[PDB]
Amino acid sequence: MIDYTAAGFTLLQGAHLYAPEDRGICDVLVANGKIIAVASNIPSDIVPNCTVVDLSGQILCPGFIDQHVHLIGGGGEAGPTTRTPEVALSRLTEAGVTSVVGLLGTDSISRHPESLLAKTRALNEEGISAWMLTGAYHVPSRTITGSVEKDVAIIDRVIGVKCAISDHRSAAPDVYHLANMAAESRVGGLLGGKPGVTVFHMGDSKKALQPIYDLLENCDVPISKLLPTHVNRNVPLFEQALEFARKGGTIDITSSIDEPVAPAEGIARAVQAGIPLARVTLSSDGNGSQPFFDDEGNLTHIGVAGFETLLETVQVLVKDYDFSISDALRPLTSSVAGFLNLTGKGEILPGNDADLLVMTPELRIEQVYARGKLMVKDGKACVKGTFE
Ligand SMILES: CC(C)C[C@H](CP(=O)(O)[C@@H](N)CC(=O)O)C(=O)O
Ligand SMILES: [Zn+2]
Ligand SMILES: [Zn+2]
């Protein structure tokens, strides 16, 4: 009778596709965790043992790429009791995230990159796709092999390096150390096929983006490799961010900060400013700590950041700021996919991974496909970690 199960065919039809481009109502044939066909009216019987999903009435779009998640945990600013746990596969998929880039933070003493690489590989095995950034806030960077350059070049899941500047938790790095680091990651990327990016944690420091502008003057690293995150933390910074974006740089906006500049507000304000969307990205900063400080560097409150804020922003964009479901999706999909050169991600077209999300017209996640495997059903995850 013949068996074609290994192929795992899947016909997702009758959905209003946003790839993100508004592609009207059309189908998507998925086989081997890959999108093998996108057109309207793919014959229900074009292939054997195919599984058809009557998505008629729902919306289909690419999964999310969260390039800022503390996969193994974070916090620690207020003692050992403030060490946030690790993230569970479920609260990721269940949040529309299919691709994620993990990093460390303030704590590099009781958090090592070697155990971040692990979770990263775990999260891969279990379904989604993960990558990590070497080092953390501390500069010189605390690596895995002893060289930012060597790390990015040889450890497969390392695509860049992270550091922290203009914050009272920085190691007070100087132009040189900052520049050297930034360059090792670029070349590392060149050798290993990684993006070679340098993510910069930003702080409420008066100096703002000064270190970056300075670093540009002290080396030759392409501005297209310098990513300032958390840019929405304070007004004077966000405005310099735009100016940085106007010179050709990409800026990462954290959706876990609701004031003084909302994520939704932030993104819109950038478009109106004239920045294209391909230079704007939204990160979550999952499982990270939300600590606040007064004027003497005293910590007052502290908590944890969740992922719910990604979709919210997207919703608050379509409504309120009169965007298109399409443009509103870009900052979490095609934009991020282009900045970190992630292939098979960000766009729905023949050849890329079946990282798909099924939502109601009102933008409520109902189903989440990750590289083909069904991860979320009816709004609740149907595939959890290994020890959840
Ligand atoms: C925006 C602000 C309220 C929170 C940010 C979050 P973060 O840099 O990601 C830090 N929580 C990461 C970590 O856990 O080390 C901060 O610590 O400055
Ligand atoms: Zn940070
Ligand atoms: Zn962070």
Side-chain angles (χ1 to χ4, degrees), residues 1-372 374-379 381-388:
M1 185 195 73
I2 315 174
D3 172 54
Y4 311 81
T5 304
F9 289 111
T10 321
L11 195 297
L12 309 147
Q13 61 168 62
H16 187 164
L17 177 59
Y18 288 72
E21 266 66 28
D22 178 2
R23 290 291 301 288
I25 320 83
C26 83
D27 319 321
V28 188
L29 215 199
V30 165
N32 288 159
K34 299 290 186 59
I35 299 173
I36 67 179
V38 185
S40 192
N41 294 170
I42 295 179
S44 163
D45 72 327
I46 190 62
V47 296
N49 308 153
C50 175
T51 307
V52 189
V53 184
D54 188 6
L55 301 155
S56 179
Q58 269 56 36
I59 299 166
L60 185 73
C61 66
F64 297 139
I65 311 173
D66 198 350
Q67 57 152 167
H68 205 70
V69 178
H70 292 284
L71 298 186
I72 58 172
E77 288 83 356
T81 38
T82 58
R83 271 162 51 87
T84 53
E86 61 171 38
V87 311
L89 169 54
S90 62
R91 48 165 34 61
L92 274 172
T93 58
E94 185 164 287
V97 190
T98 56
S99 301
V100 66
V101 163
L103 48 264
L104 292 185
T106 53
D107 188 356
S108 309
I109 308 293
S110 69
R111 258 85 173 65
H112 302 58
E114 284 115 333
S115 73
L116 201 208
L117 211 204
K119 219 291 186 293
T120 288
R121 296 188 188 297
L123 250 30
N124 272 59
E125 272 206 280
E126 314 193 83
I128 67 178
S129 309
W131 286 278
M132 65 172 270
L133 289 176
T134 194
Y137 275 39
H138 194 93
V139 169
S141 351
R142 290 161 178 166
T143 45
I144 295 183
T145 65
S147 171
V148 189
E149 179 162 271
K150 199 176 191 184
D151 268 24
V152 196
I154 82 175
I155 284 66
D156 65 309
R157 314 267 55 141
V158 178
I159 56 170
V161 66
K162 186 205 179 182
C163 85
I165 59 168
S166 292
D167 178 296
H168 59 293
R169 278 96 58 69
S170 62
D174 62 2
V175 187
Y176 172 57
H177 291 297
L178 220 62
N180 163 58
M181 172 183 80
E184 296 198 311
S185 188
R186 191 239 188 301
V187 189
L190 279 178
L191 309 183
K194 322 295 179 53
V197 297
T198 306
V199 184
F200 298 91
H201 156 77
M202 296 313 300
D204 297 312
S205 173
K206 209 79 69 179
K207 293 176 175 59
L209 276 173
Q210 233 317 80
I212 308 289
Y213 288 159
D214 277 351
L215 148 64
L216 288 181
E217 241 192 296
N218 255 69
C219 68
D220 306 293
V221 187
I223 195 167
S224 74
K225 300 296 178 200
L226 279 41
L227 183 72
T229 184
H230 302 306
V231 294
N232 45 133
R233 70 182 316 132
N234 70 258
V235 195
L237 193 170
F238 181 72
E239 299 197 306
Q240 269 176 57
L242 287 169
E243 199 72 12
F244 177 75
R246 249 154 66 187
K247 298 178 195 173
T250 293
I251 60 177
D252 189 30
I253 294 179
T254 284
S255 69
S256 68
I257 305 170
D258 41 61
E259 66 180 6
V261 176
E265 183 203 318
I267 301 188
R269 189 159 156 186
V271 183
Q272 315 180 322
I275 316 303
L277 289 175
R279 302 237 209 80
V280 184
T281 61
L282 187 80
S283 70
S284 79
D285 188 34
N287 278 59
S289 48
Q290 294 281 289
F292 297 75
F293 302 79
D294 49 19
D295 296 61
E296 291 189 4
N298 265 204
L299 183 149
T300 48
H301 316 66
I302 195 160
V304 196
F307 300 79
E308 65 274 354
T309 19
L310 288 178
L311 215 173
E312 292 186 4
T313 318
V314 185
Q315 296 170 169
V316 187
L317 275 177
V318 177
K319 317 182 180 301
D320 295 9
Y321 296 88
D322 297 82
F323 263 40
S324 63
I325 325 80
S326 201
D327 280 337
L329 271 180
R330 313 201 85 105
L332 292 169
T333 40
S334 74
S335 291
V336 174
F339 177 82
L340 303 178
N341 268 302
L342 293 183
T343 50
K345 268 76 177 66
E347 294 181 351
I348 301 179
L349 58 82
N352 303 335
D353 306 312
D355 281 15
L356 311 145
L357 296 177
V358 185
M359 319 191 277
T360 74
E362 311 93 14
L363 307 175
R364 270 294 306 296
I365 300 182
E366 286 284 292
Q367 281 175 53
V368 178
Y369 293 81
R371 205 196 305 157
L374 179 70
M375 309 297 275
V376 181
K377 199 174 162 297
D378 283 304
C382 72
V383 187
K384 302 191 200 303
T386 295
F387 289 126
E388 287 203 56

